[PDB]
Structure formats: C-alpha cells, structure tokens
Write a protein that binds this ligand. Structure first.
Ligand SMILES: [Mg+2]
Ligand SMILES: [Mg+2]
Ligand SMILES: [Mg+2]
Ligand SMILES: [Mg+2]
Ligand SMILES: [Mg+2]
Ligand SMILES: [Mg+2]
Ligand SMILES: [Mg+2]
Ligand SMILES: [Mg+2]
Ligand SMILES: [Mg+2]
Ligand SMILES: [Mg+2]
Ligand SMILES: [Mg+2]
Ligand SMILES: [Mg+2]
Ligand SMILES: [Mg+2]
Ligand SMILES: [Mg+2]
Ligand SMILES: [Mg+2]
Ligand SMILES: [Mg+2]
Ligand SMILES: [Mg+2]
Ligand SMILES: [Mg+2]
Ligand SMILES: [Mg+2]
Ligand SMILES: [Mg+2]
Ligand SMILES: [Mg+2]
Ligand SMILES: [Mg+2]
Ligand SMILES: [Mg+2]
Ligand SMILES: [Mg+2]
Ligand SMILES: [Mg+2]
Lengths: 190, 176, 134, 107, 204
RNA sequence: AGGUUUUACAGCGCCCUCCCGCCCCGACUUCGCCGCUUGCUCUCCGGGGCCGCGG
RNA sequence: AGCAGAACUGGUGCUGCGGGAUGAACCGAACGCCGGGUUAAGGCGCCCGAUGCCGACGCUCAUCAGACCCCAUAAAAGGUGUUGGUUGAUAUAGACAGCCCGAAUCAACUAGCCCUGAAAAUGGAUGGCGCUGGAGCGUCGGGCCCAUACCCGGCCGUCGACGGCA
RNA sequence: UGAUCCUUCGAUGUCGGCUCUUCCUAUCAUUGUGAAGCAGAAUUCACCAAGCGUUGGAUUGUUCACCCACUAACAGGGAA
RNA sequence: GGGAUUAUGACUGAACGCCUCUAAGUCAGAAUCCCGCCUAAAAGCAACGAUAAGCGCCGUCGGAUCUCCGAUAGGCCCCGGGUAACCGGGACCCCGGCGCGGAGAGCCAUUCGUGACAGGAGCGGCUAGAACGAGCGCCGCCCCCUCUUCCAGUGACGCACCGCAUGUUUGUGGGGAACCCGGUGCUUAAAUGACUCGUAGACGACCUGA
C-alpha cells in the first residue's frame, strides 16, 4: 500500500534560524552552525510560517519503509536544533577493580590518552572528531565529559573510548573494567 | 480459463432437458465473467454441474448474453468474494477494488490474485460481486481515495519515450 | 516544492493516446494510476484516462467530485480555461510546431533567406557591441 | 544530394539460417514502422570502388561501380526495411552506406 | 543526434554499464564510431558490496597451469567497459573485431575530446532505469578497490578540465547576453525578416 | 459534508411522475467511453512487393 | 539407478528440418528444385532475425538474488524481511506504549516473493555479456520475427485417368 | 562398500611407497571475534577464514593400524 | 607498507509515542581480499642522440603526369551538474523563464554562374593552450572593392546534349617514385662478421676492447 501523504512538522525556537537549500538543512543558533545533507531520502522539506517558520516534511506515495524516514529526518533536525540551542554532553565514568585508569587530555580536548588499563604498559591514544571537546570533569572522581553540537559526533567519540577499553581473553562478566557512558545529557540544561 | 483481456459479464441461464417425467424443469441463472461467450458457456457447465446434478449433455443453455454496466461514468467501490486453490489448500478470500465498470473490477481481481498470490485463472472462483458504498469499505487502500478535496502531486516523473531521441545532449527532467 | 497537484478540477493536458493534445478536467480520482477526466468544452467524453497520459497545467476549476458535465462546462467557461490556455506559451509552442511541420518546400526556401539575412544583422550588432565593450 | 542515408545491416536471416536474396536496411531517421511507408519501392544503390575502371553511363569510365536494388517491405517495428538487389550484396558491405533514392516518387 | 553522425561522443557519467554497452555494441556493428568518455562515471545497479564481489569472483578465473594466458582482468574503468561491449559482439569473427576498433573508451575526457559536445543516452541513465530508493555502485570506486592506480591523477586532471571550461562558459554567457541585447537594439531593422519566422512557426 | 443544521452562497444518489412528460447521439468502423457481424458491403478505390512461364 | 522386466500407443532404429545455447528419443513439423506470402513450437536488451510498444496491474533487494516442458538437484524446520488474506479479542464507562497522556490496538493462523537451513576439490557458467522503473516472478493486450510445415506460381520426375490422337 | 554393466578385451600398464605440484574445507594450529556449568590457567561450543604450517622414527609389502619421542599443531581429503 | 571491508562489537534513529547496530544515514575492524614492495615487459608507448656527385625538405601554392588503398557525400555546436528540481538576469535575497524556442525534435551553415542600375545592415606584436599541444585567440598596418548577405529589377550569354543510372562533398585526401621547372639543407653516418674480453655462455645471445 502506498500512503497518499504522510507529514510531520518541526517547530523551531525563536533563537535559531533554520534554513534549507533543497534537502540541505542548515541550522544556526547561539552555540554554532550545523549543516546536514539529506540527498538520500527523496523527500521534500517545506519551511512554512510567518515568523520563525516551522519545518514541515512530506512523503507522497511512500510504502511502509519510505514512511519510516519521515520521523527519522524530523528527529535529526530536532537534534540539530537541540545541539545548537543547548548542546550535547555525553559524560562517561571509569570502572576498575584494582588498576586505576589514568586518563590525560591533550591537544586541547581533541585527543585523550588512556593508561594503566588492567595494568597494561600499552598507551591508548583515542582522537576525538571535529567539534568534540573532551575534558576530565571536576566534582567527581573519574568521570569524563564530552561536549559538542553534533550528536552523531559526540556519541561516536564516546564510543571510540568505550570500544578502546575492551578486555580480551577474559571473562567480561568478572572484569568489568573500562570507560562506560554514564548519562547522555546537555550542556545548558533547559 | 485464460482470462484474456477484459472479462465481460455474461448472464447465462440454463435448464435440464425437458422429459415426460419432469416437464418444464427449473431454470438456473448464473453470473459469469469470461472473455467471450464460448468460455462463458463452459464456465456455466462448471459451477452448475457441481451445484446441481446436470451436465452439458443432460441440459441446455437457454440464454447467454452480455450484461452492460448501468453507470460506466461513475467511480464505484466493488467487493469480490472468491476462493482460490493455493499449493496447500483452498482458501476463501474477500478483496475490494475500485473501477468504473464491474467487468473491469473482476479483471483486476484476476490480475491481483496472480500477482500477489500466484493464482492462475483456473484456480479462482468468483462468488459474489457487489457495488459497496464508501462506508462499508474495509480496505485502507481504497479508503484513502474516500477523501473529498483530494490532492497529491506526481513526483519523480520517470522519463518515457526513451528511444524517440535515443542519443541527445539533454538529460531528462523529472520535476513537472 | 511542488506547485501542480492532482486535485478535483485540475486541468490536465493529454500528452499521448487517443485524444492527444486536448485539455481535460480531472473530475474524480479512481486509483493511484487512473483518473476520471471529462472535457466538455474540448471534445473529450468522460472516461478513465491514466496519469501517464496527462500533464498537469496551472489551471484549476471549481467543480465537486463526480459532477455532471453540465456543471463542469459552467466552471470551464467561468474560469475561461480555453481563453487562458490559447494565450499561454505552452499552447503557442504547439501552434508554432504545427506550422513548421506543415511547411512546404517553397516555405523552407523563404524561411532560409530570412534567417540567413536576419542572423547577419544580429551578428554584426553583436560584434559592434563587443568591440565597444572592450 | 538527392538520396537519403541507409545502412546495410545484414541479410534476412533467422537465428542460424541466412537468406541472401533479401537484405535488411537501416534508414537514417526512420525509427518506427509507420514511417517506412514513404520508402517502400525506392531504388537502392550500393556504390563502391573496385580496382579496374568500368564504363559509366553519361560520363567518362571511372573506377566506381554500383549494385541496384529496391525497398520491398517493412522489417519489424523499428523502421527497418527489406531490400532485394539485382545481385546479392557482398558480406563486406555490412555496416556501409546504402543510397535510398527519391524515385519512383509517389508524392 | 540520431542522425548517422560521423563520431558519436557519448558521455559515461550516470549511465549504466550493461544498458549503455548494449546500445554502443549495436551502433558499432552498424558502422558508427562511438567514443565513450568518463568511463569512471558509469555506475552499476545493486549495492557496492555486490558489484565488488562480482569482480573479485572474476579475478579468480585465472588459468591453472599458466595464468599468463588466462582471462586478462583489466582494472581500468575504460577497459572494464570496453570488455563489457566486447562480450556483446562476435569478436571471434572479422566483423566483430572490426566493430571493436570503432569503439574508443577513455577514463576522463582527453584533450582531443574536451572541446566537443558529449551526448547522453536516456535509455541507459540511472535516473531513468533505476528507482531512487535502489543502491548503485560507481565504476570508479569499484575499479580503484580492485587494482586501478590512476584514480587520483584522473580526478586532478578532470578538475583542471572543469575549471578551464567554466572560464569559457562565462565568456559564452557574456557573448549571448550581447546577442540578446543586439536583437533589442536592431528589432526595428529585422521586423521584416522575423515575421516570416513567426509565420512559419520557427520563432514562437 | 459545499453553504450556516442535509441544499442553504456547490453538488451526489434513490422513488411517484407529465405519454419513455419532450426532442438528438446510436458500440462513434458516422464526431478516438464500451461488443458482434452482412442478411452474398460499396468503390478505373489508392499504394507496395513477387512473376505471366505456354503457344 | 542413465537399473532389470511387462501392457496400450507414439517415436526412434531407417530422419533431415525450425525451437530447447549444447544434444538420438523432448516441443513443432516429416523432406523433389526454386520465387512470393503466412505460420507452428519458441521467441523479440546486445551476441542474434524480431517490442526502438511513451504496453496494463501488482509482487520482489538477496554480503550464495532470480530467470520457465523433458533438464541437469533440493527438504524438514524457521524469520518482528515484505505484501496479501482468514478468524478472534480490547478501546472516549477512554485501551495499547511510555514514564498522567488521548486514537486505534493486540494475538493466533494462512498464503506469495525474499532470506536462514545450503559443505568438495583445474578457473567458470540463467548459453555469454549483463540486467534491479527492470533484460526477475505472476496474470494479460497489441505488434513483430522464420522451418525443407500451410497457401499461390514456375520446373523435374513418379503415379493415376471412367484419355487424346493413323 | 555395494547395486548396475553405458564406455574400454586388433590392450587406458595394475597395490603401496618415493618424488613433485595444485585445489577443496567438513579448521588441528596461528590471525580477528561470539558463547559457557568462561575467577585465573586450562578446556569446550560456534563464526569470518584454506594466507600459512601440519614432523623425525620401531614393526608391517601394506593403504589402514599401534607405540616411541618432538611440536603452535603434528586436521581430513581430491586431481583416471 | 597501505586501502575497502568479513565475522563481530557499536553510534544516531524510525518502523512500533517506548525500545532497537538498520530500514535511510555513520564508526572501529582481521593470518582473508586488492594494491604497494618485488619479477617479467605487449602486433603497447614516450623523451632524445646521430642519420652515409649522393640524400631529404622547401613553395600544404607541386603547373602537369602515373599507379594503388579505404571510407565518405555540409558542421572540430564543448559549463558543472541536479532530479522531492533546474536554468538565465540583476545589487543569502529579488525578478524572469519552466512539459523545458537562452529548444541536439533544435541550432549554425547552405538554394547555378559570367558582364551594368536602384533599396535594406598575406608578413609584424601581446596573451593564453602539455591527459594523446594549433588556423590558437586578440589588436594595429598593408591587400582590391569585395557573385560581399537580402529584396526588387532590364537587356544579354554560359550546349537547351532532344524523359533515364555510378551526379554532388570532406578531395588542394592518404601512400608508394616518376618528369623539365624556382631555393635550400649538411654529407668526418651506423649496425654487423672475424679477432679480443669472460662480469656471459649448450649453439645463438650477452659484458667488453680495438
Ligand atoms: Mg581463560
Ligand atoms: Mg487456463
Ligand atoms: Mg540421455
Ligand atoms: Mg527397461
Ligand atoms: Mg540392459
Ligand atoms: Mg519408420
Ligand atoms: Mg538447455
Ligand atoms: Mg519460403
Ligand atoms: Mg534466443
Ligand atoms: Mg532454528
Ligand atoms: Mg510487530
Ligand atoms: Mg489488554
Ligand atoms: Mg535459497
Ligand atoms: Mg502448388
Ligand atoms: Mg557393456
Ligand atoms: Mg567454513
Ligand atoms: Mg552447537
Ligand atoms: Mg583498514
Ligand atoms: Mg553491522
Ligand atoms: Mg569504517
Ligand atoms: Mg551541460
Ligand atoms: Mg519565481
Ligand atoms: Mg545594370
Ligand atoms: Mg597553426
Ligand atoms: Mg559590406
């Protein structure tokens, strides 16, 4: 069955200016500028409204799989707006039983060195992505905050650290060491 | 049955051969959809032979003529009760279509059953065809066309006439 | 993005088929692929023409769905679709293409001596403006 | 120039049987079966150049030779036409130029 | 086009491999000379991992006793398309070998053809023959990952070819802008010669 | 579900009718919505290919 | 068992031809030498004659896709891949999901295409290229392509005549 | 290992070993992983995977066996 | 030594208000795969040296003669590209065009010559071009006077070869050498046999030296 129409509106706040040239949405606000390119969905994105226009997407004659991308694209633009208005904060903590994990941040947050993981002499040097800044958070023992505008870059950088501190040839149910994501919050709470 | 082209509706009536024991036997009317009257007569002796005890040699066909549509210029919502024999067993099925004439609606049923259920022409048996109002339609594929002030564009017009100019300097546009 | 929709009353141009080149009015939409068009002022009886043969124009009329051609004819003349159509460019490209296809051999001769002289006048003015611009 | 362009595509064949008595042509601007009705009957020509000089009607003996023919009927739905020449065309002419004259005219 | 032209320079960007080669192989048999440029822009249907596996499975067909005689697995996109056309020709004969000589394939647009108009076969394009929701694989990326070593140099020379043609098109636009202005300044002197063009439907 | 509740600032059905109330178009090969055919269908009625051998 | 032995009929042996890439037997059709016309079975992206139709509708994405008599392999059992269908149960006396919100939701079963099940040795086989708005599967329309087959005519020969001539 | 007897009896040299090359994966080891009645060590089940390695000897004509040591492991086969 | 990735573990995120590595879109990833490194070098090729009255070019003008071999029968019409969009114009906007005439269904050429009377509009400089490079572009002097292109005229003549085919183009075509003809070029050219060498060999070949 081809549904004749399936739409979804995305209301934007007054502090951002969402623009688009075809399917290339560009969100600009107080913290930065984001720009995604949706030339793979084959949809239309109309920007309607008198003041601070809302974003309305459409999908004409779409099957069950093509209609699933309607809310996906709307959910990506909301993350673009949320990432510029408030920003993203993916803070993760260090878990260890005997050997404390020593983490030092270099290159102004764009690189993180992980040492003393399970007593290993190897030094793990994980490099963040463009726009993601890392820092050892205060007011806590060994938590590690990651900030940025793009959710797909802050969350991917938080995965590069967690995937780097993996235990090999051991029972992962016994050796729970590593750096795991604690919570996925925001920079400016609102 | 071959189901060639458009299946036309034939009103085939028949009766047993009159004898001295049963003079003027009962007449049986049938609603047959067949490409021509030669097949429509054979379809009559297929359902009547399995409903009543009467073959082609024991009875006769009294009338076999076309049944034209009373309103060929009005969109109608049809409902077809059928039963097709799959590879495993026989299944009853009720499908809704939408066409101007009942001759073309049943034709869509043979194209749909063959496309979705791989059912040939000899396995499908049409039982009831009824012009259903727009309130008793159960299928959402027809109920979406039951919206007044309907509006939808024609996105991504695929280029036909790909061989009138077979070679050209212009790439085809698909937005109109 | 889209500016031409398949709505009740949308005047559509038949691209190919039996009534090739004549306008119709979409009265009702049967399926995803078919429509119930009816051109009362053009010469096309009411029938089910597919969307493959239709080309949407920029003219909409005020008619309910599945209305008689008596009322379609009224809204066809109230919106003067035939007057708006004949004065459009897409209708004048068709008229100009029919003239060129019906040109005789004497016409192709008179049309050749014209563009051979008309282009020499324009190409001389183009070089005159080009030298002055340099 | 008073002749349209054609191409000797091959002989009237099946899949593994050739009939050299009938040749298939490829007209220049004819890509439909309904556009061959003009060329039916026009005289064809396979103009080639051999080594020795041959006589020429209406001129000095040049090095040019010709094989005459005519268009007989349509072939398929793609504007191909059949042609029967006086002598069967040599197989080396497959893909070369065939002249389609404008006579016998019917316009 | 469609005019029995002397040399048909078909562009390769956007076209499908077998769709374009099925038409090119038919034109070379009729005696025409086809020049397919930008063979690295041809794309094949199906996702990339399928079309790469179809070629990796082709690399294994070497002759066992002596691979020097086995199937020559060409890595250049022009030579990949050239072999696709060869499979659709009777290359074992003389008319099939002569038809391959009429076809010339290039990776990019060389100087002999960068100043020519490139044609487009609509019966072989990606937008016309493939649904927008289907996957496709570019022959340039497919060739680079199987042993093509000249993808960066072709992309560098193609960028210089585009920036050199963009400078001319800016001069072609400013020349056409003067041509349109020339007709407005001389319209009173060509009114007699433009009406016969209007009368016979040449000018709308 | 047009207009402000079923015709109203559009229309869509179904009945009794005023003689089928009354006229005009007849499957449109006769003005490209849909079938079957001569009750010997009519045409110095057009066009193309093929060959007229014998006596 | 491409095994052994029977029955009816056909074929083959003794038989070429068009189609099934290939072939003893399958499908069509049986044969003097030729011109024209038209078909059968089978076909019409290119090899390769013919859809270079603005063919109709729908199904289908496969990191071993699929591609049709004989025929050149695939099963049980599974899928919240997707599309139909059957039978029931909840829900503005406000369900389902979520930690109040306010419109549909849930379960069983069944059938299509696809997928898992699916491992063999020289490099390789829808016939090849390749094809994914298709060149795939199912149901159908128009047109077109050619056999030594059908039709008309020429020629040879054989056969027959209730045959023609002193 | 049979069953069959289509090819070969105006001949296709026939058991094993030696030698040498190549392929298959139904993976013994090594590389990357998933699972446990995975605490570690050891081991077991499974996945992508045949790139690479898979031994020296006593007895037997033997393929097949059995033992002695070595080893990351001493995996199973095809190519008349 | 790298590259795309398998198994696998994940990100964002719907379908299915939640959830979800997957549907669209992304990340890490290996004795495997491809390539580099390495070995060979094609009926594949480039740069460059020298080229023997004799041996080319010049002056594509050959002025004319002969022989061959293919085609062909106006065009070497150039943005990049998108497709749920695009193009053009003007100081992210605005205007205009959009079944696409700022149109490869078109456009640019082109419609028999020779002699008078009116309308209409071949060398010097600079710059740029190397993926398989030139009649390449732009200005300033000379050249005579343009059948310049179109519309109208008047009087002539260019066999009008008596109905008939291979006509017409790119053709001042591409290759071998031939013949009087007006100017140059530099002509201290190389390979090979034998001998020698032994960094090399069955014989050839190969490395050398005179
Ligand atoms: Mg362990
Ligand atoms: Mg049947
Ligand atoms: Mg057999
Ligand atoms: Mg038997
Ligand atoms: Mg036997
Ligand atoms: Mg017999
Ligand atoms: Mg077969
Ligand atoms: Mg015949
Ligand atoms: Mg075939
Ligand atoms: Mg299971
Ligand atoms: Mg579910
Ligand atoms: Mg419940
Ligand atoms: Mg399978
Ligand atoms: Mg006869
Ligand atoms: Mg035997
Ligand atoms: Mg395995
Ligand atoms: Mg198990
Ligand atoms: Mg890598
Ligand atoms: Mg994954
Ligand atoms: Mg990656
Ligand atoms: Mg362009
Ligand atoms: Mg606008
Ligand atoms: Mg004068
Ligand atoms: Mg030059
Ligand atoms: Mg002048």
């Amino acid at each position: 069955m081809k549904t004749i129409l399936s739409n979804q509106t995305v209301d934007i706040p007054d502090n951002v200016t969402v623009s688009l040239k075809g399917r290339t949405v560009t969100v600009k606000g107080p913290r930065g500028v984001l720009r995604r390119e949706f030339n793979h969905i084959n949809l239309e994105l109309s920007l309607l409204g008198k003041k601070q226009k809302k974003l309305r997407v459409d999908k004409w004659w779409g099957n069950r799989k093509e209609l699933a991308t309607v809310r996906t694209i709307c959910s990506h633009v909301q993350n673009m707006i949320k990432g510029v208005t408030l920003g993203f904060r993916y803070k993760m903590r260090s878990v260890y039983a005997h050997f404390p994990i020593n983490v030092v941040i270099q290159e102004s947050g764009s690189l993180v060195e992980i040492r003393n993981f399970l007593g290993e002499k190897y030094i793990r040097r994980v490099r963040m992505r463009q726009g993601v800044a890392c820092a050892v958070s205060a007011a806590q023992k060994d938590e590690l905050v990651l900030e940025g505008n793009d959710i797909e870059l802050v969350s991917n950088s938080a995965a590069l650290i967690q995937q780097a501190t993996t235990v090999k040839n051991k029972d992962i149910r016994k050796f729970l060491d590593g750096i795991y994501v604690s919570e996925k919050g925001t920079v400016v709470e609102a | 049955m071959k189901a060639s082209g458009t299946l036309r509706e034939y009103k085939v009536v028949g009766r047993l051969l009159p004898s001295v024991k049963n003079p003027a036997p009962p007449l049986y009317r049938m609603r047959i959809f067949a490409p021509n009257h030669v097949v429509a007569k054979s379809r009559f002796w297929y359902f009547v032979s399995q409903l009543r005890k009467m073959k082609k040699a024991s009875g006769e066909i009294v009338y076999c003529g076309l049944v034209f549509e009373k309103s060929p210029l009005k969109v109608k919502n049809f409902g077809i009760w059928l039963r097709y024999d799959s590879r495993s067993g026989t299944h009853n099925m009720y499908r809704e279509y939408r066409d101007l004439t009942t001759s073309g609606a049943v034709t869509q049923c043979y194209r749909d059953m063959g496309a979705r259920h791989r059912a040939r022409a000899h396995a499908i048996q049409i039982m009831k065809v009824q012009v259903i109002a727009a309130n008793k339609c159960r299928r959402p594929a027809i109920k979406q066309f039951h919206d007044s002030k309907i509006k939808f564009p024609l996105p991504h017009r695929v280029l036909r006439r790909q061989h009138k100019p077979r070679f050209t300097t212009k790439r085809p546009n698909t937005f109109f | 993005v889209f500016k031409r929709f398949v709505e009740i009353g949308r005047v559509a141009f038949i691209a190919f088929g039996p009534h090739e080149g004549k306008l119709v009015a979409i009265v009702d939409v049967i399926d995803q692929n078919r429509a119930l068009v009816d051109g009362p002022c053009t010469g096309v009886k009411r029938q089910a023409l597919p969307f493959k043969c239709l080309q949407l124009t920029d003219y909409v009329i005020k008619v309910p769905h599945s209305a008689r051609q008596k009322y379609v004819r009224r809204a066809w003349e109230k919106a003067e679709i035939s007057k708006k159509w004949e004065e459009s460019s897409w209708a004048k490209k068709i008229e100009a293409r029919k003239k060129r296809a019906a040109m005789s051999d004497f016409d192709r001769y008179k049309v050749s001596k014209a563009k051979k002289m008309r282009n020499k006048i324009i190409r001389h003015e183009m070089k005159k403006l080009q030298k002055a611009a340099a | 120039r008073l002749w349209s362009k054609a191409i000797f595509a091959g002989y009237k064949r099946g899949l593994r049987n050739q009939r050299e008595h009938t040749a298939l042509l490829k007209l220049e601007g004819v890509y439909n079966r309904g556009e061959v009705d003009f060329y039916l009957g026009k005289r064809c020509a396979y103009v080639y150049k051999a080594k020795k000089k041959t006589a020429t009607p209406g001129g000095k003996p040049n090095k040019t030779r010709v094989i005459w023919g005519k268009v007989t009927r349509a072939h398929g739905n793609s504007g191909m036409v059949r042609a029967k020449f006086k002598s069967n065309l040599p197989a080396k002419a497959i893909g070369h130029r065939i002249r389609v004259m404008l006579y016998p005219s019917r316009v | 086009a469609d005019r029995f032209n002397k040399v048909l320079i078909i562009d390769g960007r956007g076209h499908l491999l077998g769709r374009l080669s099925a038409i090119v192989a038919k034109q070379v048999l009729l005696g025409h000379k086809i020049v397919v440029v930008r063979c690295e822009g041809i794309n094949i249907s199906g996702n990339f991992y399928r079309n790469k596996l179809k070629y990796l499975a082709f690399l294994r067909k070497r002759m066992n006793t002596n691979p020097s005689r086995g199937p020559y697995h060409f890595r250049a996109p022009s030579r990949i398309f050239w072999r696709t056309v060869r499979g659709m020709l009777p290359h074992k004969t003389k008319r099939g070998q002569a038809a391959l000589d009429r076809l010339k394939v290039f990776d990019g647009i060389p100087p002999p053809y960068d100043k020519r108009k490139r044609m487009v076969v609509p019966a072989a394009l990606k937008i016309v023959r493939l649904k927008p929701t289907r996957k496709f694989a570019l022959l340039g990326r497919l060739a680079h990952e199987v042993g093509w070593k000249y993808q960066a140099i072709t992309a560098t020379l193609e960028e210089k070819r585009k920036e050199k043609a963009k400078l001319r098109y800016s001069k072609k636009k400013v020349e056409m802008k003067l041509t349109k202005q020339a007709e407005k300044n001389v319209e009173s002197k060509i009114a007699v010669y433009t009406d016969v063009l209007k009368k016979y439907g040449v000018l709308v």
